[PDB]
Amino acid sequence: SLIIETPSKVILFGEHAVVYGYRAISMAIDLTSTIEIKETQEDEIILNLNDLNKSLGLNLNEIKNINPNNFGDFKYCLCAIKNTLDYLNIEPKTGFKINISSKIPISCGLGSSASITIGTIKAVSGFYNKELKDDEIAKLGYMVEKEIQGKASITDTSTITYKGILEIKNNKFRKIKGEFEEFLKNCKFLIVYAEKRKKKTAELVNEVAKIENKDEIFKEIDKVIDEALKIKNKEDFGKLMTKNHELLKKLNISTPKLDRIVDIGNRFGFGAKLTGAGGGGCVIILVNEEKEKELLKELNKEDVRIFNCRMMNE
Numbered sequence: 001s002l003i004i005e006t007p008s009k010v011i012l013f014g015e016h017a018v019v020y021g022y023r024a025i026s027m028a029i030d031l032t033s034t035i036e037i038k039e040t041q042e043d044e045i046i047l048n049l050n051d052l053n054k055s056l057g058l059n060l061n062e063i064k065n066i067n068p069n070n071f072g073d074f075k076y077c078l079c080a081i082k083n084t085l086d087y088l089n090i091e092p093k094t095g096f097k098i099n100i101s102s103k104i105p106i107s108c109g110l111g112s113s114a115s116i117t118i119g120t121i122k123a124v125s126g127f128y129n130k131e132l133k134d135d136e137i138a139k140l141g142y143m144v145e146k147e148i149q150g151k152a153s154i155t156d157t158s159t160i161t162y163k164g165i166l167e168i169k170n171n172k173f174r175k176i177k178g179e180f181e182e183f184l185k186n187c188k189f190l191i192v193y194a195e196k197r198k199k200k201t202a203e204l205v206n207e208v209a210k211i212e213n214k215d216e217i218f219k220e221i222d223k224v225i226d227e228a229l230k231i232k233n234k235e236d237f238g239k240l241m242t243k244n245h246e247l248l249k250k251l252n253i254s255t256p257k258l259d260r261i262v263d264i265g266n267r268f269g270f271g272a273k274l275t276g277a278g279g280g281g282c283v284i285i286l287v288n289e290e291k292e293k294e295l296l297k298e299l300n301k302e303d304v305r306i307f308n309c310r311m312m313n314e
Contacts, residue, residue, distance in 0.1 A: 001038040002126050006119035007312040008032060008104045009111035009159040010191065010275050010284055013225050013244050014168070016208045016251060017218035018155070023225050024168035025176075026159040027184065028312035031110060031191065033102030035077070035119040037127050039094055045081065046097040047074050060092035068148050076113045079144045080120035087140060088130050096127060105193045105305065109201075109276020114156035117141045134161050163314045180229055184311045187234060188287040190269075190295070193305035195257045197280040204277040208251045217250050238271025238286045245273030253278025261285075261304065268295040 008031035014024030040046065045063060047056045056074050058066065064086055068079040077100055085092065098120070104112045121140050125132050132140070141157030158173050159166050165181055167174040208214060224244050231237045245262050248254055258274045258281070265272020265285040272285040287295065299306055 001036075002123065003034060003036045004119040004123045004126075005032045005034050006115040006122070007160050007163055008115055008309070009156055010189075010282075011109065011155075012165075012241070012275075012284075013228055014221065015244075015248055015274075015276060015278075016205065016253070017221045018153075018168055019205060019208075020215070020218055021170060022218050022222050024155060025165065025225055025228065026155055026168055027165045028159055028163040029110075029189070029191070030309040030312060031104045031115075031307060033100070033104060033112070033115040033119050035101075035116070035123050036099040037096055037123040039096045039127070042095050044095050045092065046095070047077055048097065048099050049073055050099055050101040060095065063092060075148060076117050076144060077120045079147055080117045080140070081124055083140055083144055083147075084121050084124040087136075088125065088128060090128055090130075098123065103307075105191075105282065105307075107197050108193060108281035110191065110282065111156035111160055114141055114145065114160050117144045118157060118160050137161050163312050165311065176229075179232070183232065183237075185313070187237075187310070188289065188292075189309055190285040190287055190299070191275075191282045191307045191309055192261050192285065192299060192302075193282050193307075194261045194274075194302075195255065195280040195304075197277070199277075199279040201277040204253050204279050208253055211251055213250060217247050221247050234270045234286055234288065238266070238269065238288070240271065241273040241284070241286060242266050242271040248274060248278060251278070255280055258283050261299070261302070264295070264298045264302075268298050 007028040010029050012025040018024035044057050044059050068075040071078050104110050106112045118141050121137050138158050138161040145152035155168050165176040228240050261283040262272045268291050270286040270288045275282050275284045
């Protein structure tokens with residue numbers, strides 16, 4: 001009868017370059033999913049999507065043999081349950097129910113699925129009073145993604161499992177502490193769901209791949225991280241966010257709707273930039289407490305969803 005509240009995730013810099021051996025600066029954020037699990041004693045497992053008011057019942061002996069992509073919206077949580085079980089080498093004797101509710105917008109690079117996954121792993125393990133190291137959990141999440149999508153990157157799962165700010169390169173991460181982590185504990189950001197993403201993330205990767213100037217852009221993108229890593233004030237940091245945005249714009253994966261949002265961000269805030277693959281999605285804005293009230297009014301005058309969020313630590 002525990003309740004797991006799993007963090008969300010956002011890329012501060014590195015969006016598409018990471019894919020080419022460059023670095024990604026990922027940060028865990030307040031937007032959480034909440035998964036509650038409780039034994040039932042009916043002889044089956046029940047999954048319930050509150051936000052979508054959907055429900056599913058399965059027998060304890062179908063669990064390990066079901067195929068995730070046969071269950072639409074329940075697939076990630078479902079898959080997280082199956083893997084945690086055989087990983088713990090446990091065979092469900094008794095039943096239980098899981099209630100799922102996330103606040104995190106879907107398909108816009110915030111790690112909506114991974115949050116559900118990481119919270120299901122922690123839930124099922126704890127329900128059996130067997131705990132896993134962040135190391136085991138991160139991998140179980142990564143495998144759930146790989147199993148469902150065919151492939152996966154550690155970014156979402158590692159970021160959401162280890163919390164804080166991570167540096168992603170190739171396929172390994174580097175935790176970031178010091179002044180940079182300190183400075184971020186001091187920043188209030190805003191995730192603005194400008195528009196929906198009518199395109200698939202791989203589809204955008206291909207559109208970035210089909211660019212000549214791409215590499216020279218990635219290099220400028222990496223020099224921005226060099227500088228970002230060493231920045232001290234939100235004024236300087238904001239602009240660096242805006243600059244990375246101007247670069248992503250050179251990969252024409254940005255949109256007129258995102259640019260508008262970014263504008264409001266540079267003017268009424270400290271700077272702004274889209275996050276994740278382009279073609280719609282969210283724009284992350286570093287809040288300027290000074291004009292914060294302003295920022296809102298202007299942003300609110302738009303067909304968008306906004307979310308107050310700060311970094312998430314351990």
